[PDB]
Amino acid sequence: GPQSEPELKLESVVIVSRHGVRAPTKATQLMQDVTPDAWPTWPVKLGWLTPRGGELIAYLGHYQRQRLVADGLLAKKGCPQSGQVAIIADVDERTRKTGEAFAAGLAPDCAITVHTQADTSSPDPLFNPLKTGVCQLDNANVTDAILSRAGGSIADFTGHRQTAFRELERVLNFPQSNLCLKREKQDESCSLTQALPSELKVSADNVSLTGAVSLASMLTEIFLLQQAQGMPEPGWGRITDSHQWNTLLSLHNAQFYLLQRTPEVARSRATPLLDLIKTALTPHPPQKQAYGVTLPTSVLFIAGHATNLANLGGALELNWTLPGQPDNTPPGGELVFERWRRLSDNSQWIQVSLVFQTLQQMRDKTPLSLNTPPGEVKLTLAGCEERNAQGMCSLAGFTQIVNEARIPACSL
Ligand code: NI
């Protein structure tokens, strides 16, 4: 029967995805000391992707295949022709296995290659050029920029978020913790922000926060991973409604806003990824390039980290909050770049979106499909001056934004 008159044709898609659910990367004395309760153990070694984690990623891959078939970019049956789908992953187990899980869902039994750099025992500069010393952060500028975004000091920052820290204290049963019961001394109410003062540390290669701010960001992420993993009682059963989830994860999102979205950090850290993305999106005779991948092509899946998603958002002025997903940068969350050809005049356009499983979709292990899709937020490029009716940025305008956002000294 007669369907919607096609207005745009999908021509290429680049998905920058966070790795899936992975077991907490560290078990520290400080984590022991801020709660009287025992942290539940995990079925895999520290930092590794869990089997359920891979299954959640494979659901997104399945969904992406269905919708890309609907958009006419992939064939309904069969394996994608050689090179039509490419997968690049960071060197970590959790990212390589994420790449494999997405391929297993997108194109089961097609043995699509998950490419990495040659040495998997060393950091890949594409996913953070600061880490291998390709470039350095400007200490004065990063310090000023982050402190300003914090409200002027980290003390201002925590002071505005007392509600969330006390919610974290409740979930930990902090008052009955060793940090609290051993304090000096007994007549002062115990406070997480005050027992662990937080400072901003800026070095050439890294920015971090100490004390309660970074501890809170880690611990609230752990609760969310317990939830997504199907653990019986995340937060020892003390997280019972969605207001509580949002409140807790606000501490995690707030640290990412400071450390990973601040452009003075994000532009540098995202520069190699920016170049790769623009390479994949630009019409051009196909050519073997980074990782031995031929670009451009139909679908490129990049398996990285929440920081990468946050850095790109910061560099490109893309803002988002995810309905039903308390974590702004959730396991498996995808920043989705698409090149669309407008049929009326054959012009080229770039759309950006953020695709993600809701927390309940992870909790219930909900298989995804066209009738049960993941969540999805349409994004705008804040700096784009040439938009079409759908909010996309012209190819030329996207290229200028990337050329201004990137830092040449951080390129590969
Ligand atoms: Ni303030």
Tokens of 15: 């998905």
Q: Which SS3 state, helix, strand or coil, does residue 102 take? A: helix
Whether 376 contacts 368, CB under 8 Å:
no
Phi and psi dihedrals of 9, rounded to 5?
A: -115, 130
Measured in Å, residue 137 CA sits from the centre of ligand 1 at: 26
Residues 6+ apart with CB under 8 A from 43: 23, 50, 51
Q: Give the tokens for residue 44.
A: 């895999």
Domain carrying residue 52: 7-136+261-412
- Measured CA to CA, the distance from residue 412 to residue 328 in angstroms comes to 28
How close is the Cα of 249 to the center of ligand 1, in Å? Answer: 20
Same domain, 225 and 180: yes
The rounded Å distance from CA 160 to ligand 1 centre is 7
Q: Are 386 and 247 in contact (CB under 8 A)?
A: no
Same domain flag for 78 and 14: yes
Between the CA of 317 and the centroid of ligand 1 the distance, in Å, is: 23
Please classify residue 214 by burial: count the beta carbons closer than 10 Å to its beta carbon, then call 0-12 exposed, 13-18 middle and 19+ buried: middle
Task: Detail the DSSP E strand segments found in 65-203.
Answer: 85-89, 114-115, 200-202
Q: 299 lies in a domain?
A: yes
Q: What's the 254 CA to ligand 1 centre distance in angstroms? A: 14
- Of 243, 258, 253, which is closest to residue 167 (Cα–Cα)? 243
| Beta-bridge mates of residue 393 | 350, 387
Cβ(197)–Cβ(244) under 8 Å?
no
Distance, CA 260 to ligand 1 centroid (Å)?
A: 20
Residue 301 β-bridge partners: 15, 87
- My answer on whether 151 and 270 are in the same domain is no
Residues 251 and 217: beta-carbon distance below 8 Å: yes
Ligand 1 center–CA 242 separation, angstroms: 26
Domain assignment present for 306: yes
What is residue 202's DSSP assignment? Answer: E
**Is the same domain home to 236 and 271?**
no
Instruction: Find the helix packing angle between 306-316 and 263-281, rounded to 10°.
Output: 90
CB of 17 within 8 A of CB of 303?
yes
Separation CA 258–CA 152 (nearest Å): 12
Q: How far is the CA of 381 from the centre of ligand 1 (A)?
A: 27
Kindly give the distance from the C-alpha atom of residue 121 to the centroid of ligand 1, in angstroms, as a whole number: 43
CA nearest neighbour of 259 among 192, 309, 310, 221 = 310
Q: Is 295 inside a domain boundary?
A: yes
DSSP string, 371-398: SSPPEEEE---TT-S-B-TTSPEEHHHH
Identify whether residues 66 and 112 lie together within a single domain.
yes
Q: Ligand 1 centre and the CA of 30: distance in Å?
A: 28
Clarify whether residues 324 and 400 are in a common domain: yes
Q: How far is the CA of 252 from the centre of ligand 1 (A)?
A: 18
State the distance from the centre of ligand 1 to the C-alpha of 149, rounded, in angstroms: 9
Strand partners, 352: 337
If you search the block for the tokens 């890949």, which residue do you land on? 124
- Quote the CA–CA distance of 411 and 269 in Å, as a whole number: 10
- In the listed set 234, 260, 286, which residue is the last one of a domain according to the structure? 260
Q: How far is the CA of 155 from the centre of ligand 1 (A)?
A: 9
Q: How far is the CA of 214 from the centre of ligand 1 (A)?
A: 19
Helix, coil or strand: residue 173: coil
Resolution in A: 1.9
Is residue 128 located within the same domain as residue 151? no
Compute the distance between CA of residue 218 and CA of residue 309 in angstroms, rounded to an integer. Answer: 17
CA-CA distance, 173 to 67, in Å (whole number)? 45
C-alpha 354 – ligand 1 centre gap (Å): 29
- Kindly state whether residues 128 and 38 are assigned to the same domain: yes
φ, ψ at 141 (rounded to 5°)? -75, -40
Does one domain contain both 158 and 285?
A: no
Is 2 a member of any domain?
no
Structure tokens at 93: 């187990």
- Maximum distance among all Cα pairs of the chain, rounded to whole angstroms: 77
CA of residue 145 to ligand 1 center, whole Å: 15
Residue in 119, 25, 17 with CA at minimum distance from that of residue 64: 17
Q: Which of 296, 354, 388, 370 is nearest to 7 (CA)?
A: 388
Cα of 156 vs centre of ligand 1, distance in Å, is: 5
Q: How far is the CA of 269 from the centre of ligand 1 (A)?
A: 27
CA angle, 369 then 373 then 375, to 5°: 155
Domain boundary among 260, 287, 312: 260
Residues 129, 54 share a domain: yes
Residue 215 one-letter amino acid: L
Burial of 122 per CB tally in 10 Å (0-12, 13-18, 19+) = exposed
Q: Helices 211-228 and 162-172 sit at what angle, rounded to 10 degrees?
A: 60
DSSP-derived letter for residue 175 is: G
Evaluate the omega torsion of the peptide bond into residue 288 and state whether it is cis, within 30 degrees of 0: no
What approach was used to elucidate this structure?
Answer: X-ray
| Neighbour tally for 315: CB within 10 Å | 25
- Neighbouring residues of 188: CB distance < 8 A, sequence distance ≥ 6: none
| Å from CA of 258 to ligand 1 middle | 14
Asked if 335 and 16 touch (Cβ cutoff 8 Å), the reply is yes
- What torsion do the CA atoms of 229, 327, 309, 40 make, to the nearest 10 degrees? -30
With both helix axes pointing from N to C terminus, report the angle between 242-256 and 162-172 in degrees, rounded to the nearest 10. 120
Structure tokens at 99: 């790449």
Distance CA 249, CA 207 (A): 20
What is the three-class DSSP state of 165? helix
Four-residue CA torsion sign, 384, 387, 391, 395? negative
DSSP state of 49: B
CA of 192 to the centre of ligand 1 (A): 19
Distance 403 CA to ligand 1 centre (A): 34
Element (H, E) at 60: helix 51-70
Q: Are 304 and 91 in contact (CB under 8 A)?
A: no
Q: Are residues 310 and 405 both part of a single domain?
A: yes
Neighbours of 165 (CB within 10 A): 22
Residue 143 Cα to ligand 1 middle (Å): 17
Three-state secondary structure call for residue 255:
helix
User: Is 33 domain-assigned?
Assistant: yes
**Number of domains into which the chain is organized:** 2
Last residue of a domain, which of 208, 242, 260? 260
Name the phi and psi angles at 306, rounded to 5.
Answer: -55, -40
Q: How far is CA 362 from the centre of its chain?
A: 16
Sign (positive/negative) of CA torsion 153, 156, 159, 160?
A: negative
Q: What are phi and psi of 27, to 5 degrees?
A: -125, 100
Same structural domain, 280 and 400: yes
Please, are residues 72 and 341 in contact by the beta-carbon 8 Å criterion? no
CA of 198 to the centre of ligand 1 (A): 16
263 Cα to the center of ligand 1, angstroms: 20
| C-alpha span between 358 and 371 (Å, rounded) | 15
Q: How far is the CA of 140 from the centre of ligand 1 (A)?
A: 21
Does residue 49 belong to any structural domain of this protein? yes
Evaluate whether residue 1 is within a structural domain.
no
Residue 329: exposure state from Cβ atoms within 10 A (0-12, 13-18, ≥19): buried
* Cis-peptide, bond into residue 373, ω within 30° of zero: no
181 in Cβ contact with 43 (< 8 Å): no
Q: At what angle do helices 306-316 and 242-256 cross, to 10 degrees?
A: 70
Residue positions counted in the chain:
412
Dist. CA 152 → ligand 1 center (Å): 7
- What is the Å distance from ligand 1's center to 376 Cα? 32
Answer yes or no: is 355 within a domain: yes
Nearest to 11 by CA among 66, 72, 77: 72
Q: How far apart are the first and last CA of the chain?
A: 51
